[PDB]
Amino acid sequence: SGENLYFQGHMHEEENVVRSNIDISKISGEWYSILLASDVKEKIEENGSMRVFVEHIKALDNSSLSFVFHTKENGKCTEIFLVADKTKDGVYTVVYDGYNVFSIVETVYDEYILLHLLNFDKTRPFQLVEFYAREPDVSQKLKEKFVKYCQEHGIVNILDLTEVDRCLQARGSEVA
Which residues are noted as glycosylation sites? Predict the structure, then answer.
């Protein structure tokens, strides 16, 4: 006798984690910048060009993606509008502080996006890893996931943005 037990689920571990065949409509909407990492720490510390705080992602056509960010310039939150062009599933290019490529590494559409960017500056090229979430903070488990990804890629300058000025106060342009 005893309770018969039965395997349930799939063999791989993660639930609803999307790594390819990205559905753009479901990654659209409101996002918050949570974590930022780089191999060049100056790019993400205060005054760094890549210290940008995402606001919204929108599908533009069957290819391109609109990204709206805030960044700090001359003491103020300023809104910056970017259009990223698709080169293949999950991969885009965009011009900002030079020429960039970036990849949607992994996403849970209603929770988070992990993005890995390369910038091709001739003198000081760099990599950026970003973690966006559907809320302004995330679980410790997800922060550890991000940190492990960074470590696996040799990226050791890792900032948690959730207790510093991310220009949240600048997101109130539109009312219900």
Answer: 47, 62
Resolution in A: 1.5
Q: Which domain holds residue 110?
A: 24-169
Q: Which residue has the tokens 């890995």?
A: 116
For residue 161, the tally of other CB atoms under 10 A from its CB is: 19
Query: 33: phi > 0 → left, psi -120 to 50 → alpha, else beta; which?
Result: beta
**What H or E segment, with its residue span, contains residue 97?**
none
CATH number at 115 reads 2.40.128.20
Structure determined by = X-ray
CA within 13 Å, CB half, 87: 9
Nearest to 54 by CA among 33, 72, 36, 73: 33
